From Swiss-Prot:
InterPro entries: Trm112, Trm112-like
Entry's Gene Ontology molecular function annotations: protein heterodimerization activity; tRNA methyltransferase activator activity
Purpose: Acts as an activator of both rRNA/tRNA and protein methyltransferases. Together with methyltransferase MTQ2, required for the methylation of eRF1 on 'Gln-182'. Together with methyltransferase TRM11, required for the formation of 2-methylguanosine at position 10 (m2G10) in tRNA. Together with methyltransferase BUD23, required for the formation of 7-methylguanine at position 1575 (m7G1575) in 18S rRNA. Involved in biogenesis of both 40S and 60S ribosomal subunits.
Single GO biological process annotation from the record: ribosomal large subunit biogenesis
Annotated protein name in UniProt: Multifunctional methyltransferase subunit TRM112
Subunit annotation: Heterodimer of MTQ2-TRM112, forming the eRF1 methyltransferase. TRM112 is necessary for the solubility and activity of the catalytic subunit MTQ2. Interacts with TRM11; required for full tRNA methyltransferase activity. Interacts with BUD23; required for full rRNA methyltransferase activity. Interacts with RCM1, NOP2, TRM9 and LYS9.
Domain TRM112: from-to ranges: 2-131
Recorded superkingdom: Eukaryota
Cell compartments where the protein resides: Cytoplasm; Nucleus
Misc. comment: Present with 4800 molecules/cell in log phase SD medium.
Family the UniProt entry places it in: Belongs to the TRM112 family.
Keywords tagged on the record: Cytoplasm, Nucleus
Length: 136
């Protein structure tokens, strides 16, 4: 499951819905095996839409769990059109593409910070229901 998905997965126990600790889940980085899918094509327009949607604090938390400590504490901001993007903006976009879309968890384990429920990812598939669309 793509790194991006960790930004939209909360504990499936209904009693946890009211907790501030139901999301994000706590990924066990000692157990999560990561794989790169480089066949996913870079699309800046699509990526800009994605970056706008993510909860940045949860990106930072999960990334650190999975061994990435090179992200800025504030979500990168970008101009309103592709034409206005700098080379530096594009380099950031490329890095975000690699992180959010090309990086997948093939196998792993993650838990609810509120209730301690342990979930699993097997052959890239979590045993918690995936949402049909990604929104906060
Ligand atoms: Zn829970």
């Amino acid at each position: 499951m793509k790194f991006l998905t960790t930004n939209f997965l909360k504990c499936s126990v209904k009693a946890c819905d009211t907790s501030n600790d139901n999301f994000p889940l706590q990924y066990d980085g000692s157990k999560c095996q990561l794989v790169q899918d480089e066949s996913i094509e870079f699309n800046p327009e699509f990526l800009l839409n994605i970056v706008d949607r993510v909860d940045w604090p949860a990106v930072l938390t999960v990334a650190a769990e999975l061994g990435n400590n090179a992200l800025p504490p504030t979500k990168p901001s970008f101009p309103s059109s592709i034409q206005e993007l700098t080379d530096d903006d594009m380099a950031i976009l490329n890095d975000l593409h690699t992180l959010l879309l090309q990086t997948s968890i093939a196998e792993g384990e993650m838990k609810c910070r509120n209730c301690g429920h342990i979930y699993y990812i097997k052959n890239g598939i979590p045993n918690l229901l995936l949402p049909p669309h990604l929104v906060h």
